[PDB]
Amino acid sequence: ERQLEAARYRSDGALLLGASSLSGRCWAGSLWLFKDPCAAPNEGFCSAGVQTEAGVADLTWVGERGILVASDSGAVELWELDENETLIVSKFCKYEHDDIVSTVSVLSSGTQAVSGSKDICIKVWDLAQQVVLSSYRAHAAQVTCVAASPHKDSVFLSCSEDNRILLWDTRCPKPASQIGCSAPGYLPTSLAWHPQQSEVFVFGDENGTVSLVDTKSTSCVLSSAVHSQCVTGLVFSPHSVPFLASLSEDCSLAVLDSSLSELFRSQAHRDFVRDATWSPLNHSLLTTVGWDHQVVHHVVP
Amino acid sequence: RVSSGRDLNCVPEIADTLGAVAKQGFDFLCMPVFHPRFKREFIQEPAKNRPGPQTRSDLLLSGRDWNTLIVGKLSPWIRPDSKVEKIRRNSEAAMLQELNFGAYLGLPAFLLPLNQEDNTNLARVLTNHIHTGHHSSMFWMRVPLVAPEDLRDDIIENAPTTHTEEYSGEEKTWMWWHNFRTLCDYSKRIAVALEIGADLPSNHVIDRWLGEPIKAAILPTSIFLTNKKGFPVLSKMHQRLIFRLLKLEVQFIITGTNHHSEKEFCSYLQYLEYLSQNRPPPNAYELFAKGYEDYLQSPLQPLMDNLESQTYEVFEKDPIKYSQYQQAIYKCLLDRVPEEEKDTNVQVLMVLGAGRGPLVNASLRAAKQADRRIKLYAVEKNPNAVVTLENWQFEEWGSQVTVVSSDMREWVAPEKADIIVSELLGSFADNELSPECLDGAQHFLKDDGVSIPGEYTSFLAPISSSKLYNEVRACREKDRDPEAQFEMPYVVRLHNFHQLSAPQPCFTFSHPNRDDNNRYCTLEFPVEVNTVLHGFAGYFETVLYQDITLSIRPETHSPGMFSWFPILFPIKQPITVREGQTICVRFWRCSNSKKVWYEWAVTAPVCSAIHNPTGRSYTIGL
Amino acid sequence: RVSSGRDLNCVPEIADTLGAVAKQGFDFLCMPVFHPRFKREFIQEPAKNRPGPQTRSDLLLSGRDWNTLIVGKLSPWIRPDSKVEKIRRNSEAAMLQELNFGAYLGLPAFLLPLNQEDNTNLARVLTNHIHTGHHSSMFWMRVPLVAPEDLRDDIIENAPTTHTEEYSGEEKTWMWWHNFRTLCDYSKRIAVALEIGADLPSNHVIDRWLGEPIKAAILPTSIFLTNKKGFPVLSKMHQRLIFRLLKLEVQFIITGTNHHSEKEFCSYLQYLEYLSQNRPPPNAYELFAKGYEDYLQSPLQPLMDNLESQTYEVFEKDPIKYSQYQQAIYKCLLDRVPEEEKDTNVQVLMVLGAGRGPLVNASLRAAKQADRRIKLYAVEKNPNAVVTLENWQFEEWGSQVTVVSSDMREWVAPEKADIIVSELLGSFADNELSPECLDGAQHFLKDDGVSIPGEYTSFLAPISSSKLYNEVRACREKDRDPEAQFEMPYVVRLHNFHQLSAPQPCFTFSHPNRDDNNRYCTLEFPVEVNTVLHGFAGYFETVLYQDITLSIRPETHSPGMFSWFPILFPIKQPITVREGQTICVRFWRCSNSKKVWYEWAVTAPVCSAIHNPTGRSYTIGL
Amino acid sequence: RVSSGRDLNCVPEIADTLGAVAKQGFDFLCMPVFHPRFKREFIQEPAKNRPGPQTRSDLLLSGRDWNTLIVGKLSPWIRPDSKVEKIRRNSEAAMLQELNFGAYLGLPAFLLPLNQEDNTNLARVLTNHIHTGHHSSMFWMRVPLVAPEDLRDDIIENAPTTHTEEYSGEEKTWMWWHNFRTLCDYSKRIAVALEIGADLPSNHVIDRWLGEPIKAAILPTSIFLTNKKGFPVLSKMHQRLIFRLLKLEVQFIITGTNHHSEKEFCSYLQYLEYLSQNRPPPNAYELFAKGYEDYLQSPLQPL
Numbered sequence A: 001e002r003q004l005e006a007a008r009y010r011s012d013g014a015l016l017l018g019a020s021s022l023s024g025r026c027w028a029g030s031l032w033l034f035k036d037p038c039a040a041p042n043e044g045f046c047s048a049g050v051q052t053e054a055g056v057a058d059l060t061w062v063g064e065r066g067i068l069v070a071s072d073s074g075a076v077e078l079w080e081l082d083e084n085e086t087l088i089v090s091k092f093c094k095y096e097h098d099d100i101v102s103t104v105s106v107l108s109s110g111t112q113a114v115s116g117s118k119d120i121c122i123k124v125w126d127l128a129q130q131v132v133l134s135s136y137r138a139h140a141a142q143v144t145c146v147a148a149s150p151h152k153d154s155v156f157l158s159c160s161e162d163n164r165i166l167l168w169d170t171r172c173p174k175p176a177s178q179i180g181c182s183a184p185g186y187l188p189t190s191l192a193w194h195p196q197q198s199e200v201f202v203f204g205d206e207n208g209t210v211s212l213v214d215t216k217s218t219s220c221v222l223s224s225a226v227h228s229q230c231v232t233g234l235v236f237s238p239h240s241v242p243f244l245a246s247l248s249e250d251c252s253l254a255v256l257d258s259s260l261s262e263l264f265r266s267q268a269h270r271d272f273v274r275d276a277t278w279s280p281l282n283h284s285l286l287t288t289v290g291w292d293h294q295v296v297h298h299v300v301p
Numbered sequence B, C: 001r002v003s004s005g006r007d008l009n010c011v012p013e014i015a016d017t018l019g020a021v022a023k024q025g026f027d028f029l030c031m032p033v034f035h036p037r038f039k040r041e042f043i044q045e046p047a048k049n050r051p052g053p054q055t056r057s058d059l060l061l062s063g064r065d066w067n068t069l070i071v072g073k074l075s076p077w078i079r080p081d082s083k084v085e086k087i088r089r090n091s092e093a094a095m096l097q098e099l100n101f102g103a104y105l106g107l108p109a110f111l112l113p114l115n116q117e118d119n120t121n122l123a124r125v126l127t128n129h130i131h132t133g134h135h136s137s138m139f140w141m142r143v144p145l146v147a148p149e150d151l152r153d154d155i156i157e158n159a160p161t162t163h164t165e166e167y168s169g170e171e172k173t174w175m176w177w178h179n180f181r182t183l184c185d186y187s188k189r190i191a192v193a194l195e196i197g198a199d200l201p202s203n204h205v206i207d208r209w210l211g212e213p214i215k216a217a218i219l220p221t222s223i224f225l226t227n228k229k230g231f232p233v234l235s236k237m238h239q240r241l242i243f244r245l246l247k248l249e250v251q252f253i254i255t256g257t258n259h260h261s262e263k264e265f266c267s268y269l270q271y272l273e274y275l276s277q278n279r280p281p282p283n284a285y286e287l288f289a290k291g292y293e294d295y296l297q298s299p300l301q302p303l304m305d306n307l308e309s310q311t312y313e314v315f316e317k318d319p320i321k322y323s324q325y326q327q328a329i330y331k332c333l334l335d336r337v338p339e340e341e342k343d344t345n346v347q348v349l350m351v352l353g354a355g356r357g358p359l360v361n362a363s364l365r366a367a368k369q370a371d372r373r374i375k376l377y378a379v380e381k382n383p384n385a386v387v388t389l390e391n392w393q394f395e396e397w398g399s400q401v402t403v404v405s406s407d408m409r410e411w412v413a414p415e416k417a418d419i420i421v422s423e424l425l426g427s428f429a430d431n432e433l434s435p436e437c438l439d440g441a442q443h444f445l446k447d448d449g450v451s452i453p454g455e456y457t458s459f460l461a462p463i464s465s466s467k468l469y470n471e472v473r474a475c476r477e478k479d480r481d482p483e484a485q486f487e488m489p490y491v492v493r494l495h496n497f498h499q500l501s502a503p504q505p506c507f508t509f510s511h512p513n514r515d516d517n518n519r520y521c522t523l524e525f526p527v528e529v530n531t532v533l534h535g536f537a538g539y540f541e542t543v544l545y546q547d548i549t550l551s552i553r554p555e556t557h558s559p560g561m562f563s564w565f566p567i568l569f570p571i572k573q574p575i576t577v578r579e580g581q582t583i584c585v586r587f588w589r590c591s592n593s594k595k596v597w598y599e600w601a602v603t604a605p606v607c608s609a610i611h612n613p614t615g616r617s618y619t620i621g622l
Numbered sequence D: 001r002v003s004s005g006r007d008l009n010c011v012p013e014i015a016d017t018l019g020a021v022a023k024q025g026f027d028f029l030c031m032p033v034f035h036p037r038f039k040r041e042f043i044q045e046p047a048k049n050r051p052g053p054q055t056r057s058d059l060l061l062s063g064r065d066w067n068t069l070i071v072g073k074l075s076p077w078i079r080p081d082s083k084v085e086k087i088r089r090n091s092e093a094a095m096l097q098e099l100n101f102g103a104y105l106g107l108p109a110f111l112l113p114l115n116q117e118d119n120t121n122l123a124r125v126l127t128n129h130i131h132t133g134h135h136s137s138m139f140w141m142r143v144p145l146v147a148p149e150d151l152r153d154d155i156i157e158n159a160p161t162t163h164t165e166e167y168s169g170e171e172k173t174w175m176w177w178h179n180f181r182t183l184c185d186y187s188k189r190i191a192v193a194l195e196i197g198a199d200l201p202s203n204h205v206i207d208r209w210l211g212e213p214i215k216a217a218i219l220p221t222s223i224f225l226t227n228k229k230g231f232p233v234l235s236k237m238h239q240r241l242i243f244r245l246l247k248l249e250v251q252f253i254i255t256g257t258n259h260h261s262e263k264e265f266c267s268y269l270q271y272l273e274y275l276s277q278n279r280p281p282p283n284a285y286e287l288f289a290k291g292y293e294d295y296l297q298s299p300l301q302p303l
């Protein structure tokens, strides 16, 4: 499949690639694993791969051998990496959403996950039992992004085309809370929790602005115009003082400091930049995938 | 039974997918024609120059399959009313691309959503596409019965769902459609695909969609209640809505994934099939009227024009009408001449407009049912019909019936009449000029003479039908006033419409007229809904004799009588009527020596133009 | 097989009579609706007040039987053009009565004779009746192929039948029809029931009836020769006439009594059935063209408009056209690169307007039939078609074909072309703007480069079709010039028409143009018949390469090629052309930067208006 | 200077009367074409068959005088929107008679009042008359700037004049005109003869009449303040309104009798003349633009 959607480095340094055919006779998807990262995207030099019945919209590692997929079919499916890691088999494929599943995120436990579909619903999953615990119709439009709290199961972020960013806490009887800047700006698209502050996150909008949010202060401390077009992804580095990688439909990668100042930029991609993942082995090395079927490896100064 | 389709947003193999939904039992498929997530750049490099192909080939199906089975769907990323200039421009170029590719495949219909209040640019781009060559393709606007914002779970702590009723607020979804179709200038290519949520709104919100061009009704799998066995079913209130939609003959679309996993997808269709097979099976009136629904017709003028043979044929077979005319004569014969006078007293009885003589026959049956002697005259101006009578007079009746080949206003009679029996009523009582005809025939009625009918009264009711408003607007003809079509009444079995007030009486006439025929009547119609006035439905009642009556007034409608459909008085420009306001309509009956015509105007809540001034658009010949 | 009727002037029992002719095998019955001899007075007493009935009842048949089986006949005593004032007035009142009674029964058609030269009043009364409400009824005018005066036995001693030829005199029967239909203003409700006598006239008299609206052909039993067995048959020249009428799909009427008494009346029908079953059974072209006969169509503009998927589909299945395009490339590859250079020399080959790529495929077949290497470019401006190519490029072709999604006038090419192969011809050669397109693509052709096609030439021929003139006149639309329909060309399979001269060449274009595209051409067409000019049929020929050609020029027409039907350039007012006279037509090709259009005028034997001046009625978009 | 007319409801000798108003200095005369009090029956005997003549002869003036000098006036008894069926029918027949007699004389304009809210039947009868052959005649609808009900003296004890502001209520006079002209389908033959009372309303009521086809402005003699000398004058706010109307180039009509008895009737015209001669005399733009006012033109395409 030409169009690469997801790219995530596992702890040991293996590269998981989610892909889909968004044009041509067949509109299916696939999941690969690359133990040699400088081999990608070339299928001929991979460790394992499998074909899904439909395209993948979002992807996440469930620990070390689990792969949770958000399908066009309206299914959330968990694929199991083999005992040898040479074969990827379906554990559950649950048709619970009524439209494309667009976003997934595993909760801090790794025993539960939350999904966001274009059917406007957010659902909480039990990966052990393979059933839905909660079904939340909070939003009034397509659920764009859902980001699990790094260290709390009951807490997670979500944003939608209804222009709402919801802070969730399933411990509460009314779990959702609207939080953002002073005025209602352009629509939120990407969400990344800060790895060390449990109470701050960054949201990228559709106008190319990346904003740093404090949940406690409920007011936007600083924003910046990073991209010329929509911000499709935001991923933090594993560094002690972390870098922020920002993805966009302007086909450009950007890496920013704590105050969202431009330190790096790459025009390497000729189509949209879909996902970014930092090397756990070499923190200066950041890996992007795009719809141009490129798997570019970046050195960050 | 039910014509139904499947809505999918995921199609891996168009071949396998379409083969599966047809196997499931669906008649057609609503799918994307470009992959929903395949966002495309038209302006900014380098995404601008993305190598193709841009979608899957037209070779993957036959032209017949594209023509019959496939409904297109606008990619959900396409937002022409985005707040971002760049996303607007991309969405503009993208929308034209998807619509133009739809037209390339020759798709019967293409789906576009109404998600938000402001779909102005969406309307402009679609309007642009529609005026790109005269190309017959339908555009199903996807509108929810309740907006997603107003059915969201009350689970946002710092923004709760209001526990108060906003009468107009709960109808906002209709103003979405109204504002859109108004911007597109009431295009016959733009219809409603009404989407029905888990919890219905108030009836006034549902009633809001009467008279609107609903082509499809979308039923998500989520709104189906599970029963004891496991089958999907719908609530009693959902069934009501489905029954009303089956009368409008909509195509039912099933969206969403299967939640009744232990069943085939036909389980949903099986229920719709079961529902439509268990509707009440009327009727005397309805089954005879099946085909004429919202079909506009010129009002017949039996005076100015000679009616055709087949026209007569179909209107002498209404047993209710002639049962009533028989009984009317039956009772008049008894009341006029006593029992002891039965053999001595013969009643000179005159049928004025006898055509092929079903009233002459009615007069004979009534006579030897009441057991009284009668002398018949069959006055008929239509010389073609006179041939039928004189053949029937020679063969059957005899000298009891004198067939007169004359106009009743002209005919110099040998003797005065005991009863004048006539049949000159139209859909609006007096629109076939019964008053003028009988007035001219009145002089040869005996001083103590009866007229059957003795009385008739016309009724008006304000209606809402954007559907019927379109049909009138489409009646523009070359070589006449561009708006002439609005300034004339149409006979029509009003079907997809909304009656906005209880019918009230307009004009009454009595015979004999022991006292002119010009009239002026002001009506005030209390309206208890937000709506759009498109015209006035006209009905009538008539007193044949005493308690024996005929009516097409829906309240008091004569059972299974197909002789008259209602009349429709259109208006040029629809008038917005807000809940509580009064519709004030004005009706004139105007005439000179040659023509009779109606003029009419709305004076509240807004003034319309006076329609058909001086009969410039419409006259009825004397 | 043959739809046929029986003509009777005697009907005792309409029930028995109609039951007999249906049993005989006829599809319908031509009868009187009043007894032919029952003359009726409307003015002078005492006959004025004749007791009815005036004819037999409409009750004697079902409305269906009247609607399908019965053709009316004007009583033969009715003479509206009598020299007697009284007989005129009676005939006027009588004709309206018979026509109005025809309309009452809802008869599919009603027969009226053209017996004499002066049928002016007859035309006026029928015209009056036609403009008495818009009522769809046909009027078959009974006209003889030869007038009864000009086939009478030479048995009057003091008045002999002239033994000289009067060319125009023997066509007087046509001037009867022409003068009548002209007075009635070319009513689509007025057609010819041509009556065929025992002895046919000269072909020029028979040819005179080409392009005329013949609905019926009347065959009296007298004209049938008896054979050895006893069966009725017709002369070889009568058979020819019947075969020509069967192509026009006329209804055959049998009049007169049975002269082959030892046979059932089906004997006559059996022969017609036998005849129509033994016509030649063409064709490749004809069977594919069956349905499009005299059907007007707007000329497609593949440049200004994007062609639909199904449009492409039906025009990639013409094996003759692509056989010729394959062979054209086949021979060009051999002529350009020698045998010893076959593996070294690869020919850069460019398909300009590739659509779904039947010419790309033709270029591949030609390459490995001639055994030469080629580099393909598939330039296509239609982005919907580009999807089909890029899908086909990825799946099948490979990097041999570079699919270019551009206009050929705009595309900046990587390398110059050895052969530019194109498909941009219309029914009139250049009407789809092949010249302008290839001119803009010429700069990237190699200095020694070939164009396929190298040459094309448009042909014009004057035609007579009152039928096709009616069809154009009926294309008047609201909100444009009332005569706009006459000032634009139509694509049409010209069927009921008469070619008045041999096609002559109009405009030629060569590619590459080693030298503007505006043209002015005067043609002189020698006409050897009396006739009426209604427009000019347009055809074309093209040189793809050397001796390999395509043509829809009827003389040189490519066998069984359905890709193009002929074009029709109408004229506002028909021009009378007398035998010997020359039709002088003028054709301009006009253009600015935005539009290309044709202007045309007739300058002999009469001047027409210049049609489509400044493209006001019709332009072709650049 | 100002084109002005005299409104009279009393004309004994059309000859003497018209000769007097022209001598007074007026350009035309608004008069009744039937005696205002001469009520006429069309249905019920014996008044139905009242011997003629029904009005004074067309011979009493030249066709030129009728064409230029005479504006007709609908007899005040004619009430087509009366609550009485009989008075409606008489008023219908009577209105057609007066309008048709107006058209017979070839009058440049004919005056009809908008007195009440419901003038529906009045609009219908006028619409009927307008679509009786394409005949170029103007219909000046007499509308008051303030309705007589809303300027009545506060002297009815058990029904006082409301001491509150009704923004829309004070504009009801405009809805009278709007509803009328809308019913008549925006006929170019139907214009406003705006009648100006003693006390002007709020500006928003006056502003309401911008963009409306005002052909005449009616000034009753009562609204004219007397000055030291004895001459009639108008308040500064009345002058403003007159100045705005002079830009619209309206014809000024003087109705009512002379209250400045020690002066000729020209005293009123003399003031209008004085006013229009003492307007600001712009402009660079205005004088160059004089002739192009509300004149539609296709936008030039120099390319």
Ligand SMILES: Cn1nccc1Cc1ccc2c(c1)CCN([C@@H]1CCN(C(=O)c3ccnc(NC4CCC4)c3)C[C@H]1O)C2
Binding pocket: B288, B289, B292, B297, B300, B302, B311, B312, B313, B314, B315, B316, B353, B354, B355, B356, B357, B358, B359, B423, B425, B426, B427, B432, B491, B562, B563, B564, B565, B566
């Ligand atoms: C046989 N004979 N002979 C003498 C008298 C008659 C009976 C007769 C002579 C004229 C008429 C009548 C009956 C009934 C009423 N007509 C008019 C017929 C169309 N009008 C409609 O309203 C109307 C339209 C279309 N369809 C309709 N009904 C459908 C349901 C299947 C038939 C009704 C308007 C009405 O006044 C006049």
Ligand SMILES: Cn1nccc1Cc1ccc2c(c1)CCN([C@@H]1CCN(C(=O)c3ccnc(NC4CCC4)c3)C[C@H]1O)C2
Binding pocket: C288, C289, C292, C297, C300, C302, C311, C312, C313, C314, C315, C316, C353, C354, C355, C356, C357, C358, C359, C423, C425, C426, C427, C432, C491, C562, C563, C564, C565, C566
């Ligand atoms: C598939 N592909 N893909 C790429 C190229 C093509 C082939 C192609 C692309 C356009 C065209 C062609 C062929 C042939 C000719 N077209 C036009 C078609 C209508 N024109 C007619 O004259 C005409 C009307 C109606 N019926 C006709 N024939 C009937 C007999 C059954 C079909 C012909 C005018 C002509 O220029 C343009």
Ligand SMILES: CSC[C@H]1O[C@@H](n2cnc3c(N)ncnc32)[C@H](O)[C@@H]1O
Binding pocket: B302, B303, B306, B307, B352, B353, B354, B355, B356, B379, B380, B381, B382, B385, B406, B407, B408, B409, B423, B424, B437
């Ligand atoms: C049954 S519809 C009324 C019938 O009465 C006839 N009719 C209508 N008006 C008149 C009239 N003025 N005099 C006589 N017959 C009439 C019509 O031709 C029709 O057949």
Ligand SMILES: CSC[C@H]1O[C@@H](n2cnc3c(N)ncnc32)[C@H](O)[C@@H]1O
Binding pocket: C302, C303, C306, C307, C352, C353, C354, C355, C356, C379, C380, C381, C382, C385, C406, C407, C408, C409, C423, C424, C437
């Ligand atoms: C087969 S008909 C000719 C084909 O060529 C394409 N065509 C017409 N004009 C041009 C042009 N100027 N450039 C490229 N393609 C063209 C049309 O879209 C059609 O598919």
Ligand SMILES: [Cl-]
Binding pocket: B285, B554, B557
């Ligand atoms: Cl009913």
Ligand SMILES: [Cl-]
Binding pocket: C285, C554, C557
């Ligand atoms: Cl041929």
Ligand code: NA
Binding pocket: B028, B068, B071, B108, B109
């Ligand atoms: Na369909």
Ligand code: NA
Binding pocket: B573, B574
């Ligand atoms: Na409108």
Ligand code: NA
Binding pocket: B595, B614, B615, B616, B619
């Ligand atoms: Na009239």
Ligand code: NA
Binding pocket: B615, B616, B617, B618, B619
């Ligand atoms: Na008319």
Ligand code: NA
Binding pocket: C028, C068, C071, C108, C109
């Ligand atoms: Na026939």
Ligand code: NA
Binding pocket: C573, C574
């Ligand atoms: Na002509």
Ligand code: NA
Binding pocket: C595, C614, C615, C616, C619
């Ligand atoms: Na031009």
Ligand code: NA
Binding pocket: C615, C616, C617, C618, C619
């Ligand atoms: Na044009």
Ligand code: NA
Binding pocket: D028, D068, D071, D108, D109
């Ligand atoms: Na004047």
